[PDB]
Write a protein that binds this ligand. Structure first.
Ligand SMILES: *[C@@H]1O[C@H](CO)[C@@H](O[C@H]2O[C@H](CO)[C@@H](O[C@@H]3O[C@H](CO[C@H]4O[C@H](CO[C@H]5O[C@H](CO)[C@@H](O)[C@H](O)[C@@H]5O)[C@@H](O)[C@H](O)[C@@H]4O)[C@@H](O)[C@H](O)[C@@H]3O)[C@H](O)[C@H]2NC(C)=O)[C@H](O)[C@H]1NC(C)=O
Ligand SMILES: *[C@@H]1O[C@H](CO)[C@@H](O[C@H]2O[C@H](CO)[C@@H](O[C@@H]3O[C@H](CO[C@@H]4O[C@H](CO)[C@@H](O)[C@H](O)[C@@H]4O)[C@@H](O)[C@H](O)[C@@H]3O)[C@H](O)[C@H]2NC(C)=O)[C@H](O)[C@H]1NC(C)=O
Ligand code: HEM
Ligand code: HEM
Ligand SMILES: *[C@@H]1O[C@H](CO)[C@@H](O[C@@H]2O[C@H](CO)[C@@H](O)[C@H](O)[C@H]2NC(C)=O)[C@H](O)[C@H]1NC(C)=O
Ligand SMILES: *[C@@H]1O[C@H](CO)[C@@H](O[C@H]2O[C@H](CO)[C@@H](O)[C@H](O)[C@H]2NC(C)=O)[C@H](O)[C@H]1NC(C)=O
Ligand SMILES: *[C@@H]1O[C@H](CO)[C@@H](O[C@H]2O[C@H](CO)[C@@H](O)[C@H](O)[C@H]2NC(C)=O)[C@H](O)[C@H]1NC(C)=O
Ligand SMILES: *[C@H]1O[C@H](CO)[C@@H](O[C@@H]2O[C@H](CO)[C@@H](O)[C@H](O)[C@H]2NC(C)=O)[C@H](O)[C@H]1NC(C)=O
Ligand SMILES: CCCCCCCCO[C@@H]1O[C@H](CO)[C@@H](O)[C@H](O)[C@H]1O
Ligand SMILES: CCCCCCCCO[C@@H]1O[C@H](CO)[C@@H](O)[C@H](O)[C@H]1O
Ligand SMILES: CCCCCCCCO[C@@H]1O[C@H](CO)[C@@H](O)[C@H](O)[C@H]1O
Ligand SMILES: CCCCCCCCO[C@@H]1O[C@H](CO)[C@@H](O)[C@H](O)[C@H]1O
Ligand SMILES: CCCCCCCCO[C@@H]1O[C@H](CO)[C@@H](O)[C@H](O)[C@H]1O
Lengths: 553, 553
């Protein structure tokens, strides 16, 4: 007998529970719907659904008018809308968390065991006819071919939003504090136990590592002086596990929070910035607190850095990414009147979603010099001899790639795209159309409606068979891209929920934490509130170069 | 220079931060108060404080006039009040949590490291003149002598509320799932990482141990059958670490979630009840879902037993303890309106508070037979000799001892009381009156006001010197009891916040979790809703004896 939940019979966040031998029922409490499958709307929701404009109309409003939005930003409407954005986006995520790789149901282990990644949609059951549920062919398309035919870059398609490499390396550095898929436990498991903006990519995911990175004097982290400039210390000085090529001198090796940051100079660049920030913050804290011990100077400085990160992400990072004329604002006080759970669990969906690999260009330009992938990768010297200020200027000037649209990931890093598609099948993720339903969108009727283009659509028809068989990661990477945007609509409608939930779901945003005491007084509290990417770099360097998430134009 | 925060200058929930050499500044954010010390009230606070009745007046209303409460319990006023009972009690607790034994401030480590017990008040700083801060003598009164002169039982004083040993054992059994002080790590640390009603005393504090208890067929835990009755398995079948005295046979040894439970027949009794219940629930779940594997059958059965506990504890356990004429009601939907955090962390002060050793009698009576402490303690044969039925009847008829008042903890277990006081000083807990202010009460002006008694109050002043120097634990047990009640006001006013926060703060009480599907449909969802102490026993036994938290009368 065929498993009923393979058809995904229930709508609007309803739960498919199997009863008896071949039967099923659906629990649709607080979904706003009624019925056996739950399609009958309630008084309130029927009014809510007919007076709702499409996600296209909202995107059109936020990205048009210059004009209307200049007024909104200069008034209280700015805060009224920001509260609404935070409210409506975050509700689309289970909190407390629901499912994981092992359990397609709510359990105590799924709540307690933080080594698991979270899961919004249940897995595609192993007793389903097709691998994507009910619709499609017996064997899924080849992971290698799809990447080679639809993802592989041929011509460099730049980002129309003016995104630079400086963003890319930030989008990698920042993202790697909550995405740490373990090689030991395998897919669906994480090492980054902080599950968000904890800075376990600066201080480390465990305490043993943290104590090694610390100088134990003035609350500062260890450092080495190269060319009269502050850099992360050598492994010979602070012995921690770092993924470096075998044979590299211990002096050249640099010790940081995240063990992967050594492989790219861009990652080690940001690791240098935050380090240089942490220590100078300790200097400002010791100025008004001479009685404070080493522990307090350290722990308070961390929270300031956590607060600065979220400020810079919300107000500057996401701002560039969204392309809104609405001036996004980091103010936790906005959620003080509403019901919000101050916790977050990192989902595998978000992991799969955040594989923005098409940012990485064909080469890496540093001023008059041009560097290849074989030259740029694993380079240990490049960080030091160029310096921070000269290297930041280089990444802030070079244009980054277009994420959406397709055919825009370099061949050197193409081996990651296939792993994502292969790992998705191991996770048994539901088809793209089912993930659109969950995030308040309409499922695509055809492959034509997905891409808008004709040629690439016909080839996807023949491979997948049905549109309801299309996979999660290819769907996002091949969705039609509205002329002057970085990616398709689904990326925003799915990404923003996870993003905003994790950024505001931080405990420092809660009423009990969001106060001057937590940050050692007014001085620390203002540092959190007035932080910008420009002040993160230039206040730490010697000369202030060009620094933004957009190219100079 | 003397540390300014030793005087406790910051009134109400105001945070004392130290600035410069000999200065301090006080952070009165969201406390309702203004000024350098948090003493100038806002419009609303000034209104609220004048219209607010004293806690002793409200207790009088809740424990008098049966006629008025008969009208309230049969109407929605029962819900309106119960919601208010939940909201205003839980609001007195920081969530996300604040301090621990290592940090007198807010830090990420304090939020992240689950091994720590929490603090509501920060510790008495190490650089204060007296050990209690500013007032009292240079050396605190002898811990061993305090316990012998004021706490030691002489004549048996039973509880006037008619509390039986059946309650007392439940109290101990239930409470030891979140109280697990690590001997390896020391005081201020816990092994119960679940922090609340997770049933880590039934399934274990870790996953490696959990699996050892599980049968892995039909979601049931392992069990052995003696005399025809179901009992927890032997260590020979389920090899888990337990604190049995060296020399005991592996057959008479019985394996459960909590390692200490093998020491007392009362603790091992309840362990058998919840064992039979879990396996009983698995039978009913298998009936509805034949397709379910072992894991889903187990995980759901755990959640149902989690719900059953939170029902019994509120509607019967706390009902008996409080003696309120208002019928307490467990409905998570009451908190669906206001702002609530579904997150809990056990405080070290909650640990000190729950040490209700006066509950235990001079001897243990089982029908026409009487068992001394030497006989009752550590017996393995005892619970199997009489069975569950006879033992349940026995403890339900014997009266427990009054916790408050004084002189009611038996000499056999008196050594614990000494350790609690000794540990308090290691944890450096703030004086009793400072804990009173924090829980919305007035500090005691003298020792006479605390006791309502002449002789023992006079010696207390001779031992301590100042009332503001009285310690947390002795202050709770040596407080004037209201006539007919089980303990003094302070234990209600401090305990109930911790108790109701840990019960309703459980993720199963959240909108995401509190669904029919979570408990495998209607059958499991009603089991949670119709859970009583009587049902927990009668359904799992052949014959049902007297079952209640109070003596028959
Ligand atoms: C978060 O979640 C993850 C995954 O759930 C978890 O990771 C670990 O999970 C398990 C359990 O700890 C680890 O171990 C694996 O499980 C098997 C068990 O299978 C067999 O076990 C029995 C054999 O052991 C014992 O046998 C005799 C008696 O039978 C006994 O006397 C001996 O002492 C002996 O130990 C056997 O009876 C049974 O029939 C099974 O065949 C282990 O054998 C082995 O170790 C497995 O690897 C995993 O390694 C962990 N990783 C993963 C990826 O699963 C985390 O622990 C959890 N985190 C937290 C904080 O809880
Ligand atoms: C919960 O959080 C607890 C915070 O106290 C953790 O405490 C435990 O781990 C600590 C470190 O792993 C222990 O602290 C000590 O640190 C000193 C300092 O030396 C430092 O360690 C290096 C290796 O030993 C040295 O090379 C280097 O010099 C460095 O400065 C060390 O001498 C001690 O040996 C010890 O490591 C601490 O003792 C320990 N227990 C307690 C009770 O504090 C827990 O790790 C954490 N628990 C869990 C379950 O996550
Ligand atoms: C040229 C630089 C890049 C290289 C060499 C690279 C390569 C890799 C490799 C080999 C892995 C798997 C290793 C592992 O973590 O187990 C990985 C993971 C990942 N990458 Fe990249 N990639 C690059 C660019 C980027 C960028 C710019 C982003 C930012 C969006 C990104 C996002 C991610 C994410 C989110 C993961 C998963 C992390 C985890 O769960 O462990 N990658 N990358
Ligand atoms: C005769 C039966 C009892 C015995 C033999 C007993 C014995 C003990 C002992 C030896 C300790 C360790 C204290 C220490 O660190 O020195 C302890 C802890 C404790 N007891 Fe009891 N006790 C009994 C009854 C009770 C009762 C009725 C309660 C009420 C709930 C209770 C509550 C507690 C609590 C809350 C702890 C602290 C747990 C921890 O943090 O480790 N006990 N008990
Ligand atoms: C690592 O980066 C450094 C840049 O500091 C590279 O050194 C440069 O190499 C180019 C040729 O590719 C020379 O023209 C420059 O004069 C070099 N600059 C300096 C300051 O030495 C180095 O080649 C890179 N490493 C690898 C392995 O490619
Ligand atoms: C509930 O879900 C099922 C499955 O998706 C829907 O379709 C089923 O029921 C119909 C009854 O008339 C049959 O015609 C279909 O063949 C049958 N299909 C499957 C795959 O089971 C059904 O329409 C939904 N019910 C409602 C009221 O919308
Ligand atoms: C706030 O509280 C402080 C400490 O409890 C009060 O005490 C201060 O003033 C006293 C004289 O009235 C001095 O003798 C104390 O030493 C001094 N404390 C310190 C740390 O300097 C103080 O009165 C209160 N503040 C105000 C403005 O009244
Ligand atoms: C533990 O208690 C049990 C009760 O079951 C004791 O066993 C009984 O002891 C009583 C004495 O009051 C006698 O009537 C019986 O002979 C015993 N019954 C059996 C079946 O042996 C036991 O002695 C106690 N253990 C200790 C160490 O004192
Ligand atoms: C009418 C005033 C415009 C305010 C814009 C609010 C932005 C909220 O964004 C909304 O998020 C929801 C959940 O992700 C989606 O269902 C909506 O399509 C989307 O517009
Ligand atoms: O002008 C526009 O301004 C908008 C922000 O106001 C963004 O969409 C872009 O920077 C730009 O196209
Ligand atoms: C007529 C009875 C009114 C019942 C409503 C009061 C129940 C709310 O509980 C209240 O919590 C407060 C804060 O912890 C305490 O100060 C009060 O003593 C307590 O009554
Ligand atoms: C509004 C109800 C009117 C009844 C008058 C009520 C008398 C309340 O008087 C109460 O007596 C108690 C004695 O146990 C004290 O604990 C309280 O402090 C006191 O307020
Ligand atoms: C220091 C703790 C103060 C908490 C007091 C909270 C009092 C609740 O305030 C009440 O809330 C109601 C909604 O439930 C509103 O209808 C009332 O207008 C409002 O007075």
């Amino acid at each position: 007998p065929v498993n009923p939940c393979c058809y995904y019979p229930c709508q609007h966040q309803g739960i498919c529970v199997r009863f008896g031998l071949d039967r099923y029922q659906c629990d649709c409490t607080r979904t706003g719907y009624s019925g056996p499958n739950c399609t009958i709307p309630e008084i309130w929701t029927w009014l809510r659904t007919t007076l709702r404009p499409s996600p296209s109309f909202i995107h059109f409003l936020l990205t048009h008018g210059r004009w209307l939005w200049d007024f909104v930003n200069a008034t209280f409407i700015r805060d009224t809308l920001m509260r609404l954005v935070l409210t409506v986006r975050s509700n689309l995520i289970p909190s407390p968390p629901t499912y994981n790789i092992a359990h397609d149901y709510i359990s105590w282990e799924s709540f307690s065991n933080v080594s698991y990644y979270t899961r919004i949609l249940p897995s595609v059951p192993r007793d389903c006819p097709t691998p994507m549920g009910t619709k499609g062919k017996k064997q899924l398309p080849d992971a290698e071919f799809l990447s080679r035919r639809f993802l592989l870059r041929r011509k460099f398609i730049p980002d129309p939003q003016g995104t630079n490499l400086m963003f890319a390396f930030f989008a990698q550095h920042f993202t790697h504090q909550f995405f740490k898929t373990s090689g030991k436990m395998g897919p669906g498991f994480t090492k980054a136990l902080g599950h968000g903006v904890d800075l376990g990519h600066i201080y480390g995911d465990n305490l043993e590592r943290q104590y090694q990175l610390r100088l134990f004097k003035d609350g500062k982290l260890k450092y080495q002086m190269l060319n009269g400039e502050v850099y992360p210390p050598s492994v010979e000085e602070a012995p921690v596990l770092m993924h470096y090529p075998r044979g590299i001198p211990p002096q050249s090796q640099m010790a940081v929070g995240q063990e992967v940051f050594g492989l790219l100079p861009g990652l080690m660049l940001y690791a240098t910035i935050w380090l240089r920030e942490h220590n100078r913050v300790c200097d400002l804290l010791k100025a008004e607190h001479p009685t404070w011990g080493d522990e307090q100077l350290f722990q308070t400085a961390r929270l300031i850095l956590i607060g600065e990160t979220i400020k810079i992400v919300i107000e500057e990072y996401v701002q560039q990414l969204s392309g809104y004329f609405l001036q996004l604002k980091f103010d936790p006080e906005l959620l003080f009147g509403a019901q919000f759970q101050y916790r977050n669990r990192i989902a595998m969906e978000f992991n799969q979603l955040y594989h923005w690999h098409p940012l990485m260009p064909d080469s890496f330009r540093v001023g008059p010099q041009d560097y290849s992938y074989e030259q740029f990768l694993f380079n240990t010297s490049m960080l030091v001899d160029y310096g921070v200020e000269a290297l930041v200027d280089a990444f802030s000037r070079q244009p980054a790639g277009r994420i959406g649209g397709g055919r825009n990931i370099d061949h050197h890093i193409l081996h990651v795209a296939v792993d994502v598609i292969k790992e998705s099948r191991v996770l048994r993720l539901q088809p793209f159309n089912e993930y659109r339903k969950r995030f308040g969108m309409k499922p695509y009727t055809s492959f034509q409606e997905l891409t808008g283009e004709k040629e690439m659509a016909a080839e996807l028809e023949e491979l997948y068979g049905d549109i309801d068989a299309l996979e999660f990661y290819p769907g996002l990477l091949l969705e039609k891209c509205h002329p002057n945007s970085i990616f398709g609509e689904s990326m925003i409608e799915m990404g923003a929920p996870f993003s905003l939930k994790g950024l505001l779901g931080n405990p420092i945003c809660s009423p009990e934490y969001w106060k001057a005491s937590t940050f050692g007084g007014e001085v620390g509290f203002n540092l959190v509130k007035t932080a910008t990417l420009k002040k993160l770099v230039c206040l730490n360097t010697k000369t202030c170069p060009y620094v933004s998430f957009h190219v100079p134009d």
